[PDB]
């Protein structure tokens, strides 16, 4: 059974640390003592012998493990939470809000000179794919037609 551990690298050379770590594994052929390497912190599926500990700290541009002590360094705590966040990440970020504003509903403009402005859709045109919303420019409402993607639903 291989448990997880946290490695600190020089932040910025992290992919090169991961590649050099895989290569040191396949050099010193302790292939049965390493499972994966996940990407300033590098996650390593590993077991704990002092030989494998010296192996990971002899990988270049690696400071050391992060744990309770340096004798017996520490596996993890909320590893499941980290895995869940990694699975989402881009998926969670993706939103793409389009103007679903109907009669009276407020919308947001992010394209053309009217970008960075909000307003309400007094009239909507699904057939012409156009929303009739006015922007409060210099006080007076500026009824302009914007596409669903041109504006966001507020």
């Amino acid at each position: 059974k291989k448990r997880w551990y946290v490695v600190q690298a020089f932040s910025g050379f992290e992919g090169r640390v991961a590649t050099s770590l895989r290569e040191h594994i396949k050099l010193h052929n302790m292939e049965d003592l390493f499972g994966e390497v996940m990407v300033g912190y590098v996650l390593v599926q590993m077991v704990m012998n002092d030989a494998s500990w010296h192996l990971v700290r002899s990988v270049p541009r690696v400071m050391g493990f992060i744990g309770g002590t340096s004798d017996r360094p520490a596996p993890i705590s909320d590893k499941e939470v980290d895995a869940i966040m990694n699975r989402l990440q881009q998926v969670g970020d993706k939103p793409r809000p389009k103007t679903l504003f109907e009669p009276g509903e407020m919308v947001r403009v992010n394209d053309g000179p009217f970008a960075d402005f909000n307003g309400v859709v007094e009239e909507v045109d699904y057939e012409k794919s156009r929303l009739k919303v006015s922007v409060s420019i210099f006080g007076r409402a500026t009824p302009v037609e914007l596409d669903f993607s041109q504006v966001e639903k507020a």
Partner: protein
């Protein structure tokens, strides 16, 4: 203030404050993300030392 050439010769306190603010932003983001215990212990320890 810059020197003759134009590159800004920056003071040391700006390095210190900029380090503390970089680390504090990292620590707020990790407490947002619910990182595990050893990550936020190293993060708060680096803030303490900063």
């Amino acid at each position: 203030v810059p020197l003759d050439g134009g590159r800004f010769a920056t003071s040391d306190l700006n390095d210190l404050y900029r380090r503390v603010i970089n680390r504090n932003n990292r620590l707020k983001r990790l407490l947002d993300l619910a990182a595990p215990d050893i990550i936020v212990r190293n993060e708060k320890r680096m803030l303490q030392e900063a």
